[PDB]
């Protein structure tokens, strides 16, 4: 009986200021049906946006996640929520005759955003290596896992999100660990494979306004 898309509306998603592109798509929202507010039904959605759909000089085997927190007259003013890699890239990296090394740390930001960072780094066959295998002994792996736990402990702790996200976008963190682990066992593809989001502060409007402009 009822054609429901006459009862809809159309909002715009707009990225925060770390990225070149801001308006990156649409999002359907049913209007206020008296009781439930149309802004209320929008207030928590996540957006699995890639990298080259946000910053143009960049390779898009990475992703980001973004919360429509505020509804300000047909704009989704959008926060940072999380980060992970493309599963095709993940399945591409895990070869056989090398070693997978991981670590995970729970770090706070300076502004109350509790993060859980992950790390993935692989051993690297040398450019004169003849042995098919490139494995690190288990104590070498516990060394490398500690610096992986060390480097991304300080950098979220020292900073806030607007500086942390900017470290994520060229993966400034993972390029540090690559140089910092050459002396133990040379690594190959060291990334922050995934970043979770554990807790948030009380919500601040003007923090988000300054996070856009």
């Amino acid at each position: 009986v009822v054609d429901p898309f006459s009862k809809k509306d159309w909002y715009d998603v707009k990225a925060p200021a770390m990225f070149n592109i801001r308006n990156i798509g649409k999002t359907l929202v049913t209007r206020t049906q008296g009781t439930k507010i149309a802004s209320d039904g929008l207030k928590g959605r996540v957006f699995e946006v890639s990298l080259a759909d946000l910053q143009n000089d960049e390779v898009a085997f990475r992703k980001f996640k973004l919360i429509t927190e505020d509804v300000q007259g047909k704009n989704c003013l959008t926060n940072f929520h999380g980060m992970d890699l493309t599963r095709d890239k993940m399945c591409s990296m895990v070869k056989k005759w090398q070693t997978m090394i991981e670590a995970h740390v729970d770090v706070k930001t300076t502004d109350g955003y509790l993060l859980r960072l992950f790390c993935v780094g692989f051993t690297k066959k040398r450019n004169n290596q003849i042995r098919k295998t490139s494995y690190a002994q288990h104590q070498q792996v516990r060394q490398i896992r500690k610096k992986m736990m060390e480097i991304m402990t300080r950098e979220v702790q020292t900073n806030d999100l607007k500086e942390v996200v900017n470290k994520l976008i060229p993966d400034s963190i993972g390029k540090d660990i690559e140089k910092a682990c050459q002396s133990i066992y040379p690594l190959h593809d060291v990334f922050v494979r995934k970043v979770k989001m554990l807790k948030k502060p009380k919500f601040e409007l003007g923090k988000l306004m300054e996070l856009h402009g």
Partner: protein, 192 residues
């Protein structure tokens, strides 16, 4: 560097596409042309120098040497100008300069109709082992005279004694030749 589908045709003198022909010309200082109507200035190709007896041949097809007869030919890239400035990138990298997978014991020399000696020289008399012509041929699936009859692929040869002796293509399985003999093969393989 894309392809941008025009560039396949963009990939007094002479018109030779053989580098053994093109090498001798520019060392005299003889500017020639090609199917490209412009003259030649750059000659980029590959030759094979014997790592054993230091003997370069312009042939890229052979894998055994012409002077010493070993498998010590290695890939050598050249760059020849119109004047004939021979400057050759000898790849100084010990992944190629390597004695690793080079010593292994060989089976007894076997003589018979179906013996397979492990291809040492370029001309020792192998027995005539050939594929059956109903197996050796692939599909010319381009050709539109194609609809009538059999399955959408080539029929596999399960009948002949070319298949029972497991005769394979000499080009097929070449990546297993590059594997060193003394390695960790899986416990249920058997090659040729």
């Amino acid at each position: 560097g894309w392809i941008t589908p025009s560039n396949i045709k963009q990939i007094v003198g002479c018109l030779t596409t053989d580098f053994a022909m093109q090498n001798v010309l520019l060392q005299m200082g003889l500017h020639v042309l090609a199917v490209n109507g412009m003259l030649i200035r750059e000659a980029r190709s590959y030759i094979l120098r014997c790592h054993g007896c230091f003997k370069t041949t312009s042939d890229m097809s052979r894998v055994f040497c012409s002077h010493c007869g070993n498998k010590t030919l290695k890939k050598v890239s050249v760059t020849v100008s119109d004047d004939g400035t021979l400057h050759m990138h000898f790849s100084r990298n010990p992944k190629v300069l390597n004695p690793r997978g080079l010593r292994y014991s060989l089976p007894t020399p076997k003589g018979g109709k179906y013996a397979i000696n492990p291809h040492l020289t370029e001309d020792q008399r192998f027995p005539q082992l050939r594929l059956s012509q109903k197996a050796r041929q692939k599909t010319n699936v381009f050709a539109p005279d194609y609809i009538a009859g059999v399955s959408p692929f080539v029929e596999n040869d399960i009948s002949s004694r070319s298949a029972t002796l497991q005769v394979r293509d000499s080009t097929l399985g070449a990546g297993r030749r590059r594997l060193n003999p003394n390695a960790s093969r899986k416990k249920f393989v058997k090659k040729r």
